Amino acid sequence: KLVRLPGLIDVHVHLREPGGTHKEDFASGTAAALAGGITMVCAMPNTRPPIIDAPALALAQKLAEAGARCDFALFLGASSENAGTLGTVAGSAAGLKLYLNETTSELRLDSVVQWMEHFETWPSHLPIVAHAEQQTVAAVLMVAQLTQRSVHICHVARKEEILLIKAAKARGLPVTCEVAPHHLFLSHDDLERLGPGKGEVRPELGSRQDVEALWENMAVIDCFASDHAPHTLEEKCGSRPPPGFPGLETMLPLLLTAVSEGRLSLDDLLQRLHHNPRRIFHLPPQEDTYVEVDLEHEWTIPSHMPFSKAHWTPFEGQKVKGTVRRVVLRGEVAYIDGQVLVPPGYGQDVRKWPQGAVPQLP
Amino acid sequence: KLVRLPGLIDVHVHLREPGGTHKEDFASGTAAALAGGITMVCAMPNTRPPIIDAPALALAQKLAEAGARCDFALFLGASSENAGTLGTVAGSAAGLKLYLNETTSELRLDSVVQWMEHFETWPSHLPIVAHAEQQTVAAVLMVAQLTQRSVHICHVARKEEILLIKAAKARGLPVTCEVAPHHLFLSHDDLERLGPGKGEVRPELGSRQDVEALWENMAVIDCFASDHAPHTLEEKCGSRPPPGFPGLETMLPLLLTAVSEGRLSLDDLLQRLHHNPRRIFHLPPQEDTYVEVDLEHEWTIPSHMPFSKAHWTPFEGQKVKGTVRRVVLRGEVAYIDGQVLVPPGYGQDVRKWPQGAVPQLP
Ligand SMILES: [Zn+2]
Ligand SMILES: [Zn+2]
Ligand SMILES: [Zn+2]
Ligand SMILES: [Zn+2]
Ligand SMILES: [Zn+2]
Ligand SMILES: [Zn+2]
Numbered sequence: 257k258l259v260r261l262p263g264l265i266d267v268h269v270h271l272r273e274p275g276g277t278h279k280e281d282f283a284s285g286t287a288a289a290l291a292g293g294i295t296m297v298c299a300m301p302n303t304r305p306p307i308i309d310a311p312a313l314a315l316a317q318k319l320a321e322a323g324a325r326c327d328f329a330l331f332l333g334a335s336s337e338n339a340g341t342l343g344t345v346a347g348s349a350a351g352l353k354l355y356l357n358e359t360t361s362e363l364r365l366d367s368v369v370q371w372m373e374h375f376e377t378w379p380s381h382l383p384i385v386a387h388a389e390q391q392t393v394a395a396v397l398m399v400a401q402l403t404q405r406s407v408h409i410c411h412v413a414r415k416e417e418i419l420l421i422k423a424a425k426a427r428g429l430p431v432t433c434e435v436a437p438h439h440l441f442l443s444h445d446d447l448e449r450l451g452p453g454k455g456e457v458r459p460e461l462g463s464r465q466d467v468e469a470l471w472e473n474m475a476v477i478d479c480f481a482s483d484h485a486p487h488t489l490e491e492k493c494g495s496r497p498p499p500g501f502p503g504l505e506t507m508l509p510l511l512l513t514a515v516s517e518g519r520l521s522l523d524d525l526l527q528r529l530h531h532n533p534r535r536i537f538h539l540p541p542q543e544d545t546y547v548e549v550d551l552e553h554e555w556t557i558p559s560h561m562p563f564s565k566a567h568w569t570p571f572e573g574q575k576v577k578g579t580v581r582r583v584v585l586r587g588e589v590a591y592i593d594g595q596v597l598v599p600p601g602y603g604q605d606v607r608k609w610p611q612g613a614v615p616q617l618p
Numbered sequence: 619k620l621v622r623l624p625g626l627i628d629v630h631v632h633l634r635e636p637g638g639t640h641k642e643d644f645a646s647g648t649a650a651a652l653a654g655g656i657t658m659v660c661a662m663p664n665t666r667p668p669i670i671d672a673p674a675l676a677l678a679q680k681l682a683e684a685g686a687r688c689d690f691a692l693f694l695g696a697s698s699e700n701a702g703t704l705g706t707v708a709g710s711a712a713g714l715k716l717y718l719n720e721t722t723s724e725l726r727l728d729s730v731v732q733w734m735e736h737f738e739t740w741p742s743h744l745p746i747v748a749h750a751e752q753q754t755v756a757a758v759l760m761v762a763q764l765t766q767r768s769v770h771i772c773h774v775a776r777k778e779e780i781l782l783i784k785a786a787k788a789r790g791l792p793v794t795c796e797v798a799p800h801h802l803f804l805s806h807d808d809l810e811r812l813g814p815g816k817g818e819v820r821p822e823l824g825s826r827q828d829v830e831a832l833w834e835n836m837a838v839i840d841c842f843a844s845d846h847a848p849h850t851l852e853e854k855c856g857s858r859p860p861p862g863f864p865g866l867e868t869m870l871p872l873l874l875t876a877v878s879e880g881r882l883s884l885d886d887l888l889q890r891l892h893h894n895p896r897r898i899f900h901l902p903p904q905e906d907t908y909v910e911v912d913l914e915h916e917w918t919i920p921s922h923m924p925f926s927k928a929h930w931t932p933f934e935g936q937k938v939k940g941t942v943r944r945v946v947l948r949g950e951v952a953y954i955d956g957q958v959l960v961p962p963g964y965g966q967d968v969r970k971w972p973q974g975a976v977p978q979l980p
């Protein structure tokens with residue numbers, strides 16, 4: 257009755273530690289990951305302090321080693337001051353994150369020349385990922401070509417963006433991309449229900465035509481990733497709502513529903529939540545690690561999932577078919593039927609495993 | 619000084635056992651694989667008897683389990699009589715092999731309708747690979763679309779073929795392909811040296827323009843695979859030369875030379891000899907497995923490599939930079955500097971590992 261999947265990987269999560277632990281911490285965010293059938297996460301650097309230098313990375317690594325329940329890697333963040341300074345720690349990170357649209361004064365880059373400087377100084381064998389919306393996708397692709405290296409585009413959300421990436425791939429350019437579940441399963445049609453606070457997300461929800469273009473161009477999508485961006489309901493419904501949705505606990509149930517409906521195959525799903533994340537980010541295998549899912553159980557997403565401290569979900573009310581029943585991580589039962597069974601600190605930094613270093617020429 | 623690589627995978631080898639063991643056997647062919655930095659091979663079914671039914675597969679599995687020194691999976695072969703009969707053993711094979719051009723009376727398919735029948739009856743979640751040259755590439759792609767599933771094209775050798783596959787990928791069709799080293803590093807210019815016997819291979823050596831098109835379209839190539847096709851020198855130089863080159867021991871040195879010359883990156887190589895083979899064929903990770911290579915040592919390929927019983931090589935005289943120094947397979951030293959150190963039978967059938975079954979819906 258159950259289907260055994262390999263350990264799934266989410267390459268785009270915000271776990272809020274250090275500095276935003278009321279929204280989520282490593283322990284709660286990785287519990288959410290396990291309950292969503294995810295056994296490895298890559299955590300983004302827009303924490304407080306942001307992970308933009310070696311001291312901040314060192315702090316975040318110890319906090320994750322002590323709090324994470326699943327395995328992880330941590331991104332470094334590009335700033336207006338750190339190009340050329342990250343070489344000694346670069347290989348210990350998941351990759352480098354560029355925030356190319358509206359952002360915090362610390363990750364903010366004010367000039368494309370600063371993007372160039374990062375592409376030129378970051379080690380050429382290590383991953384670079386970009387938050388790049390609309391024409392910014394084209395712009396960062398140009399910078400990647402000028403510096404003759406690859407780039408990965410986060411959360412593609414629009415017909416415009418997926419078709420641009422499609423055209424770049426047709427020209428043989430080294431670009432990969434990911435799509436988040438809210439851009440496949442929500443649209444403008446849902447903003448009346450969500451309201452302008454809860455509905456705030458970046459990239460914003462697309463039109464029906466945007467959603468249909470992403471599905472029609474599934475072949476262009478290399479990865480799914482949640483962009484798990486937990487904020488409390490008070491923050492989402494308050495005066496200055498921060499953008500973002502929680503998504504770790506809902507991503508796999510949503511996608512399994514789509515598999516059961518024949519919208520994509522099980523293999524299509526596993527390429528995008530396992531094999532392609534591995535190969536783009538050079539993430540190591542996890543020994544004795546698997547996820548058991550039940551594809552027959554129909555349920556309705558409630559007003560909040562059990563684990564994320566966000567304590568809300570934009571998918572409330574959607575019917576899904578597909579449940580995570582059991583997760584085994586490195587030989588230990590990590591999750592069964594609504595209970596996480598590995599403690600904070602069980603998770604490890606995969607970049608410290610010998611098989612987790614990115615291969616490079618001498 | 620040494621570069622650590624993961625365990626490399628060759629998805630296209632002919633190991634000649636059962637029935638052609640003077641050309642190669644599991645023990646000698648997997649020694650050649652290890653000396654070439656390969657830790658897992660997928661063996662083709664055109665043996666004697668050919669692996670076209672459950673009894674033949676059972677025999678080949680035991681012979682491989684007893685003789686293989688590295689890990690393996692075995693292909694089943696499509697015949698004019700076995701469509702609809704392989705369902706119980708299909709999941710235990712690497713995949714199904716279709717020989718669509720000139721071949722033996724046992725793997726010979728006389729009608730595209732027989733290709734259709736195989737695409738319709740072989741389990742939809744399991745791999746299908748095709749020897750398909752020139753217009754046969756287009757024909758098998760059509761059959762794949764009619765049956766709405768994927769196909770993998772073996773040894774792409776011509777500008778015509780890579781551009782057709784390129785066009786299919788631009789239309790979002792589920793097709794992958796592999797290229798063999800002789801089609802990247804040899805051409806018509808080498809036939810005078812090789813002669814018409816040694817030079818006989820299928821697909822035949824291409825023109826300079828074919829070779830240049832493959833390099834220019836590297837982005838379209840998903841895998842490298844040797845098409846290791848050992849025949850003795852007596853056979854290659856005799857009256858009716860069989861097509862094929864040995865290649866396990868020369869593939870990685872040739873490609874490392876190209877990396878050192880900047881023709882492709884180390885990552886490009888590892889996508890094509892590790893990550894993409896894994897994800898196309900759902901091959902499991904190998905624990906505690908790695909290859910150490912030396913990228914500074916310049917040497918000239920001799921008249922025969924140490925291990926393959928073929929006892930000849932078409933790459934004789936080429937200068938290479940790159941050597942396999944050490945291979946560790948599942949925690950045991952398997953190869954050092956010209957000596958294989960694991961015995962016949964150390965290798966295992968990866969499809970019997972829990973992590974080596976192809977995931978499928980209930
Ligand atoms: Zn973002
Ligand atoms: Zn991302
Ligand atoms: Zn994000
Ligand atoms: Zn890798
Ligand atoms: Zn062939
Ligand atoms: Zn092949």
Ligand SMILES: [Zn+2]
Pocket residue numbers: 630632662845847
């Ligand atoms: Zn072959």
Ligand SMILES: [Zn+2]
Pocket residue numbers: 526531896897899900901
């Ligand atoms: Zn797989």
